[PDB]
Amino acid sequence: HSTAIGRVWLSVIFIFRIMVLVVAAESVWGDEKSSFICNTLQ
Amino acid sequence: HSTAIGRVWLSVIFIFRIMVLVVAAESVWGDEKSSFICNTLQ
């Protein structure tokens, strides 16, 4: 019992999301804190 | 033509002011700008 459209489309969109997250996490967000700087001596 | 009280008192107060200014300018106000600091990286 499974719809024809869903097994094709949901899985593809899920894989796309996973791939985008993999290519984004390592490089884009890697230095999110280390390169965060404020104009202060505090 | 000069008042008796004035020549005695005004000159003394003037000399006192000069002496205080001399003892204050060299040391108290000498580092007024060099030691002025602000909490900033700007």
From Swiss-Prot, chains A, B:
Signal peptide: none annotated. Coiled coil: none annotated. Changing C38S: In CMTX1; suggests a failure to incorporate the mutant protein in the cell membrane. Changing V22M: In CMTX1; localized in the Golgi apparatus but also forming rare small gap junction-like plaques. The chain crosses the membrane at residues 8-30. Changing M19T: In CMTX1; functional channel; localized in the Golgi apparatus without reaching the cell membrane. Changing V23M: In CMTX1; localized in the Golgi apparatus without reaching the cell membrane. It is found in: Cell membrane; Cell junction, Gap junction. Changing S11W: In CMTX1; severe. A connexon is composed of a hexamer of connexins. Interacts with CNST. Belongs to the connexin family. Beta-type (group I) subfamily. One gap junction consists of a cluster of closely packed pairs of transmembrane channels, the connexons, through which materials of low MW diffuse from one cell to a neighboring cell. It is linked to Charcot-Marie-Tooth disease, X-linked dominant, 1: A form of Charcot-Marie-Tooth disease, a disorder of the peripheral nervous system, characterized by progressive weakness and atrophy, initially of the peroneal muscles and later of the distal muscles of the arms. This is Gap junction beta-1 protein. It comes from Homo sapiens. The chain holds residues 16 to 57 of 283 of the full protein.
